[PDB]
Amino acid sequence: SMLKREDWYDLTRTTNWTPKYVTENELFPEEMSGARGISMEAWEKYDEPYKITYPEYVSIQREKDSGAYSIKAALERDGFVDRADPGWVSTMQLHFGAIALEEYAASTAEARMARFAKAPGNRNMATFGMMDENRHGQIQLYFPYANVKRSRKWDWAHKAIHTNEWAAIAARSFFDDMMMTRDSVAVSIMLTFAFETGFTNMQFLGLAADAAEAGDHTFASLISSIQTDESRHAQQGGPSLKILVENGKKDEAQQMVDVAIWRSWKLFSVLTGPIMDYYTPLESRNQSFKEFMLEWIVAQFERQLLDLGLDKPWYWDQFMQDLDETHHGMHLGVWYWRPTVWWDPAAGVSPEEREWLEEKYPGWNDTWGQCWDVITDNLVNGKPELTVPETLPTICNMCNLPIAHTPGNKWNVKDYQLEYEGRLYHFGSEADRWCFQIDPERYKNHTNLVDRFLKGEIQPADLAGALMYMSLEPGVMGDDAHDYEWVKAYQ
Amino acid sequence: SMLKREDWYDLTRTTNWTPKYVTENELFPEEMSGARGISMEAWEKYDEPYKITYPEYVSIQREKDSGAYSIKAALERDGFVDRADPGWVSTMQLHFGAIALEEYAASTAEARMARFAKAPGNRNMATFGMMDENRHGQIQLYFPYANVKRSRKWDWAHKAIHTNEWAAIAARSFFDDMMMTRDSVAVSIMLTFAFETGFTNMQFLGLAADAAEAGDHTFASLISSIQTDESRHAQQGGPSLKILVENGKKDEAQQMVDVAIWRSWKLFSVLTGPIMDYYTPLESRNQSFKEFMLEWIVAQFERQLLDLGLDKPWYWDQFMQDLDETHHGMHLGVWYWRPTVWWDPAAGVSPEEREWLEEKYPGWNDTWGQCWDVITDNLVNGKPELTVPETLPTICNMCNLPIAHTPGNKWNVKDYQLEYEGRLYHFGSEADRWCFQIDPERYKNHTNLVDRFLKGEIQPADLAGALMYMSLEPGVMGDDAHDYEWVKAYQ
Amino acid sequence: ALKPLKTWSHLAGNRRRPSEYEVVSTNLHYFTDNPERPWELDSNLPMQTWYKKYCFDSPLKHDDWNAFRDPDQLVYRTYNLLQDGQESYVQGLFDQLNDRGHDQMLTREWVETLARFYTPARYLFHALQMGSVYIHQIAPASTITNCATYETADHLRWLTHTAYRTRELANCYPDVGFGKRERDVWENDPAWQGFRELIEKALIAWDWGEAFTAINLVTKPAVEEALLQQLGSLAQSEGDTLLGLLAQAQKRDAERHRRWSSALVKMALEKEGNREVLQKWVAKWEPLADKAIEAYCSALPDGENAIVEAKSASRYVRQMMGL
Amino acid sequence: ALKPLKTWSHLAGNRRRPSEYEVVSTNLHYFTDNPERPWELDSNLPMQTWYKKYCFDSPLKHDDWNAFRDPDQLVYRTYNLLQDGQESYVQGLFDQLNDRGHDQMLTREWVETLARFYTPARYLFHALQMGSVYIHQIAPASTITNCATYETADHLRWLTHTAYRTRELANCYPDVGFGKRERDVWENDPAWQGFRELIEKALIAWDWGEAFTAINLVTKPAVEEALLQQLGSLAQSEGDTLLGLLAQAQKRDAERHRRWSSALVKMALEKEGNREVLQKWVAKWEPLADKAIEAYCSALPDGENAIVEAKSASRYVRQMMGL
Amino acid sequence: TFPIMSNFERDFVIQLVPVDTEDTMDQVAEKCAYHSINRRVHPQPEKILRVRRHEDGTLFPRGMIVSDAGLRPTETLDIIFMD
Amino acid sequence: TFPIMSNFERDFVIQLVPVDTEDTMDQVAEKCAYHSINRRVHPQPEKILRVRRHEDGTLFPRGMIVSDAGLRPTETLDIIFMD
Ligand SMILES: Oc1ccc(Br)cc1
Ligand SMILES: Oc1ccc(Br)cc1
Ligand SMILES: Oc1ccc(Br)cc1
Ligand SMILES: Oc1ccc(Br)cc1
Ligand SMILES: Oc1ccc(Br)cc1
Ligand SMILES: Oc1ccc(Br)cc1
Ligand SMILES: Oc1ccc(Br)cc1
Ligand SMILES: Oc1ccc(Br)cc1
Ligand SMILES: Oc1ccc(Br)cc1
Ligand SMILES: Oc1ccc(Br)cc1
Ligand SMILES: Oc1ccc(Br)cc1
Ligand SMILES: Oc1ccc(Br)cc1
Ligand SMILES: [Fe+3]
Ligand SMILES: [Fe+3]
Ligand SMILES: [Fe+3]
Ligand SMILES: [Fe+3]
Ligand SMILES: [O-]
């Protein structure tokens, strides 16, 4: 016979001891551990709600991969990617290039907690988290790998984060700030709670669903399986949050959440918004990016924050409004600057689409529809050279994303500047600037693409030089997804 | 460390012993064993070319099912069967209804050898064969089961062989004769060698390939996996054949092969021929049923028979010719009598199709094209009541299939009658009648649908009565696959 | 017109949603559709007569054998999953005990004991394999047959473990005759004649009911108690950890066989008269089982005591089934 | 325009088709792209300084650490497949030895020996878990990190086996204090202070090179020889088959760790000066290992002999790596 | 009421056909034509239908009745176009 | 040669715009209009373009030169339609 898991589980996490040959601070340095005055005994209250043991882990995961890799191989010589909508294909290349290596990097984020968390249970769950991310990184390199011969763009599933292409810099700016350069407790708050539980867990669910609609059962299965692993480690932040509130650290906890959520939002608006609102065919659009956010992200955050006795972010009112524009700018920005990304941005501004955008968003054509009105005319009046840039867009020093807001009649684009120690910074939002001011020494000497351009680090100092600096060349350089097919509609 | 499989394999099959408390004949009755004078020692020379042991078996098969069942579940809520060509859907219902339970029945065929074969190695390989067929039967009941709510026709995957619908009687006539009522050695010859190695092994391969073209990855994976198990037990006939030739039994062996191959062909012409020559869309037709047979069945049989020092069947010359008509009759017969089967037969006689049939078959329209000419006119001239029967077609007493040959100009339909002990028999071919004469006591008092009708066993004795006798009712009763859509072509 | 169902037509009318097990294992045999002419050929063929006499005319009766359900509900998919795990465990024992040179520290006495009482079992286990595979092809229902199908694979598994271990023993003690003498021991050693006569006679009991009884209710419990329990207990006491644990591993399959055999007996007793039929058969074969146990165990150390324990334990299996 | 390749751009130029292992494990770390500012933030953050000092400025040098390849080529998929099998085996041992009441026939002396020398290892194994997980996050290459990733999971596995067994022991001998005293033994028993001082000091060796050395080349071999080999050999002699075989099972992971550690050392020696660096580190930590073995083994029966064997065997691991 | 099998010229399969023991071959052919003509065979009024035994190919008169042709129950018969 | 950011009216994003330290706001707006007008903004000849500092909203004269407006390098500026 065998024991019931409940009878011996606590012993797997009864591993803390009183150091003697070295001091507690030496063994657990604050910069890595982040115990924040809270004692070892107090941290031991940490108790993950979802429990699992080694034998169970290797057994379940073995099965998940058997299925996933089996699906992939069965549909391998089917070449769906070929006869699939350019909007979808482009969606995948964007996903992989931005996520593969970051998934892997997260394995080190977990490893950070596995070694330096004073909470024994967090240390073990982080070890499983470490293995989860090791999996995601590998499986999301193995899958796109099947398409390297169809286009060099697929090579970016591995190369993107190794370049200085703006989106890559944006991705790294976020991740390094949330999970790679923060102490153990901070990581559980900002990555596992704020980002993995708050966004990616439900996101991946929709991606998998949408991928299913598209007819890509290989990619659908991929994301479905990976998503089932998320909760297992995403759970690590709640307990840390209770411990901090439980003790005298509610404020410190409060802003990590404030900061982490905004930053997750910014990066989220450029990579997910454009996707379900423009790259997705019209007859396959369930709800709008705004609808999706309110019903699957906004609500949960409110519920969650409530249960942990935390307050809604100070910027929450503004954040709620931006759901009506931010991802619209980000999109237009990416499509306009289409040759500077590794995937083909879709316009998604056909007659029907443009109205769809009007139903979901009040007065879209009176603002966003404007800019698109022009661009569409130039393409109708054979002047394609006016739909691409000849200059760099101003960049937010925090999210390293273009500073863009409401256009057209209801114009409102703003720039929340800030001068600190003989230097002028630019932020595409009030929250973005705030993230900077609450801790300057952390972002101070960093520099976005523009700062580098102005310092002479991009040479030659012209378009061709910037392209070569971002490691981009024809073949991978972006252009309109449907090859401008959507123009024949306007003559 | 562990031993190499080659060092201990022989011991797994070193199980024969000299009975003492019962006699060899009691323990191994000839009617079940079929040692045919060949001694225990002589049978021990039996040595399967493909070897496998228990641990290896359960490990490999566990993986095959993980994948297959994983594929199925991933594509489950995709409902391909719905938006799939009626020709395909009809193909599957035909496959399942005719094979599911026969696959299972084969597990007993294997069990026959596992217990009564005097060859130790055959006994063990038959035990694995037993498990293989147990698998095929179950997995091919589990898969169609997903469609019971879409149509009662799917219920036939389980019910068909339990009825007296003519195709069911045809299926059972073959199988019971080849594997269920033959002694151990005879089974290895007629089922494993003649039928499984000679037909189903390559057939399933093409089915899987065609299913792939159709876009049914669930069914494709299903057949692909099952097919990989075939060789493991299909191999059992060769060794028995060598032993018989090796000894004084070349003739006895010769006709089992003669008989078994013809019967396999007959049943094959009605269930596979119509499929790849008519139910398969035109733009998805690789080669013709005739091409397929010559290149994947005919050749191998010649090679095989050669290596075992056996002669080509006496009927081989005729058999080669029939590839130019038999499956054409069988088709027309099934479509005409479409309401008497559980699937929707496809006409596959559109303009393009009819020419396709001409390219693959010389002078098709001058013979088969005739009958179809008429039928098409009646449908054009609103007289659908003349495309269905009002009488029973004469039935071959051996293959229990309709006696039909070349029509039109080159008319040649023949009936190879035979009178034996105050009774008149009918056969749709010279070989069919031969199978009867070389062993009368085995088929003597059996009776086909017509014999039963004429004896008063079908009551009421009319169409409605025959339908109810075959367990058929509206909903499952067949009709044209594409609902006569192919007629609009001829106005 | 006929409306589509939620399950197979023969399972419609059920209360709870049919399980995978029920979906792929019930009402599969078709030879029982026509007892007059089970197979679609002449009604006088030998195999028509075999099934009518040995399946249909068995004194063990019931009106709906297809109602039988495996208590373990084994299916091909679950069988492999279950056994693959057990085989991983057995692979561990062989490979890792080998690594620690477990075979070299066995006494000479014990090795000779293995040559006489252990390795020849490959013949007895294969006979059990033949025995249950016959039950497969003669039982009146598919759910009954599958239980026989899986038990048959288990007997092959026991055979396989034995063949492998025999090779390892021959490697370590090439003078004993491991792998070369088993047949002679099985055929000529008085210790084995008890079991040999039992299975040889049992192997020609064609009635599906008597086959089930002679093999699963009388012979198997006798074989399991003598070999797996007694010799296995002896292996443990002699420090042969490998065999001790191998025996425990195989007992798990033996237990499963007793479970379905028990359920079949329980279903049979629903009909008046079947208990008497079963007991009469048990009364017929029990005597040969006693002789098997006596001849085998008497030759082991503590023989008389081993005989009493085995007779007692095997009989208890049948008592808990109501006999 | 750029033409599509047959493999990742960084693997193009290779002779043989890249394996799955190479496809999903190579050149993954990006913090090594800019040693001046490893992370995409201010160049003065503590974590920028940590990586520049402990990863980039390590005296163990090489021009292309990404060239390192796991001799076992472990990947997440193959790791699970491999360990799932091993865990099925371990599950067998626990479950089936339990079934035969293996725990009740252990002597009182041996039980007390287990309370002092076995169950407290849960602390030592978790420390090894922390130790290798630090290597994961500070190594200069992803192929190096993954070897650390998997070894970390193995240490958690050893911890887990120990926690489970400790519960079973507490159930069978509730008076001994199983599960309740381990910490006190680990912190206060002179037999454990040797190992404790060793890992506590080793756990604060932040240089990736010294971490690898102190943990994988000095501490682990010491821990494995003392616990898995010596105590495991003792378990066998005391008839504790379970622990004896559990030790053998865990040694298989320990062997894998030595294999990749060996390959990394081999690659390091390609560069002149690294051997000296490694030896200097080994010369620094070997003394604490000796004290660990001495304090632990001296307290076991046949102590002095166990000490000599362990020192000898652990040193041999490093000698075969060229030191 | 007597059973026979119909192998109609230019058709593609023999069929079971009920005829009376008094019908003249002309009537038999008429009954058989019902299960063949206008179904999968183009009529030919210009020509006349005849019925001969299939086993030996014996052509039967137009006015010969089923009762005289002997015939074994189930006997196969050919119906052909002639003059 | 002096850098500034352009926040063109009715546009949707600020852009980096190179101007000379001598251009009059009219010339600055002209340069900025190049990176905005006819790209994603409908022209308005009827009206005149003006340039004001974004931080405080200070409207700058049409003839005022970059060298006098002070301006911090990178300074953001609004270009609007007026009279
Ligand atoms: O075609 C598609 C593009 C994007 C998504 Br999300 C789904 C379908
Ligand atoms: O597919 C995606 C994954 C992550 C983010 Br953030 C955005 C899109
Ligand atoms: O529904 C969704 C589709 C795609 C992404 Br990315 C996120 C949500
Ligand atoms: O001169 C340039 C044009 C375009 C970009 Br983007 C950057 C510099
Ligand atoms: O649509 C199809 C019908 C039959 C076959 Br076979 C393949 C495709
Ligand atoms: O799908 C099929 C399987 C077997 C035969 Br025979 C014919 C068709
Ligand atoms: O190519 C083939 C398609 C279907 C069947 Br059935 C057999 C062969
Ligand atoms: O009277 C009948 C009509 C059709 C068939 Br089929 C059988 C009898
Ligand atoms: O059945 C067996 C399982 C493992 C080995 Br190793 C040998 C035989
Ligand atoms: O449960 C048991 C099954 C078989 C034997 Br032998 C002993 C115990
Ligand atoms: O790691 C473990 C494997 C099996 C059991 Br049971 C317990 C722990
Ligand atoms: O190969 C071995 C690994 C570890 C130990 Br401890 C002993 C032997
Ligand atoms: Fe992940
Ligand atoms: Fe995650
Ligand atoms: Fe099969
Ligand atoms: Fe088969
Ligand atoms: O994750």
Ligand SMILES: [O-]
């Ligand atoms: O098969």
